[PDB]
Amino acid sequence: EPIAVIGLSCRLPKASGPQELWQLLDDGASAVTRVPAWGGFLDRVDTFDAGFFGISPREAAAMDPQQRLVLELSWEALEGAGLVPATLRDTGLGVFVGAARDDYATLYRRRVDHHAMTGLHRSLIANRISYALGAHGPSMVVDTGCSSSLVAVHLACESLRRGESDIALAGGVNLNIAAESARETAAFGGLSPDGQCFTFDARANGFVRGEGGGLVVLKTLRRALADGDLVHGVILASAVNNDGPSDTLTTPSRRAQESLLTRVYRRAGVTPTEVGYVELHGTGTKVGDPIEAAALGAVLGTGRDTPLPVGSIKTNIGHLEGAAGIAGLIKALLQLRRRRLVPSLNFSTPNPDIPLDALNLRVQQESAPWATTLVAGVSSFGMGGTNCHVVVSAAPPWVVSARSPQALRDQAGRLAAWADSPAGREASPVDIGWSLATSRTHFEYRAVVSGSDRDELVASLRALASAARVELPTYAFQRSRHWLE
């Protein structure tokens, strides 16, 4: 049974939103910079708006920043999907978050109140979302590895198909706070000294550090059509398997990937010569990249008149190693929605060990429009051997509210900026007003503007900042520093 994707949220280096991520990917820019006293690092990871979620500053000080980031991502995802969180209380909403790092606990333990137990456990990452949203559905954290996010997405889809959950939250998160994780990672010697991910390139020497998070809202296609929700995409089928008896536990196996791809394309009703793009899991390594290329050529490259376009998002932001699958799924969904294929960086000379011409595969290194429905595939291979694949097809007076005066003025300014942006110019002002009045929850503080033109409304909103359904620029938080001492 197909699963309807209706909304998503993400937080990536140099990309604080889906629009920012699309702008970064379409412009061919890399967010991998040096450590802010190589790799993609977020900005102000120690800042959190604890007042919005009703959390005391003392609890937030010992709180894992990953939990706060996931809570903010979930709030943004539910806001962007047109669903009021207050209407999700006492409902069987499922939460699926895949995390595999707890470096905050190591930082706390290397150098004792009652908040340490609650704030240093992986289950509370999803339990806090369940508590805040009042969800009666299943909530758990799956530890898979580099493919934890895709495993969580597959579990959410299976739960939706079974019927025990009506709305699911699937995604992942990863943060690199402690230098101990970096030291252990460099001990393995799998980091490229150049600090870049040379996917399907002859200069591949390893991957680069990356951090960030992503979440997505999953619902059944029938229920989404019944409720009239705007569908971002359609997940057709997914499957999870393991390499099994390979040469080494770390070394991946081609046969398992081939079988996984064949089985995931068999039940999805998708034949070759109609898949327009495939999201690569390659981390710029000279070991697994040839295996992945050979598997893709054997499964999808065989019997194809035109070369299959391939690419990866790790060339821009890096290997998040805890949220790679959800990031790839978000990139594929954005490409499907915009009907364009973003270029992939770090590709100059083809890998001699990879016969791209023989495998009927080509790396997309130029922004080109997408033409025919369009089918894309996102693959995530865990380090231990777990592999997942997801197939996604394309879908077939202004009131501003906030809990603080400064927050209200920030919301008004951001709304005015979004309206002035060309993205918001494609929607009529009546649609914007309807979305603000129906798809946005009413807070303690509110402001109402009126006018006869869009420019007048924007001017009024900026002055105070000192029916179809359309997207809105999420919520503007007032983050404050909360760190251990």
Partner: protein
Amino acid sequence: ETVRQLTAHVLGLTAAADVEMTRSFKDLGFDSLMSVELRDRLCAATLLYDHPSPAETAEFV
């Protein structure tokens, strides 16, 4: 005096000035442990379960 809301600093709101009355303990953050601690912190000056805001709590004294 009578109110002397100086023990609210256990909430972590810096000085005991940012704490606001006519509110609810569950919104500002109060579990069983903090409730018991605050009940035992008034020995130097029902009573808390039925008195959410600090105003009615200090109304007793």
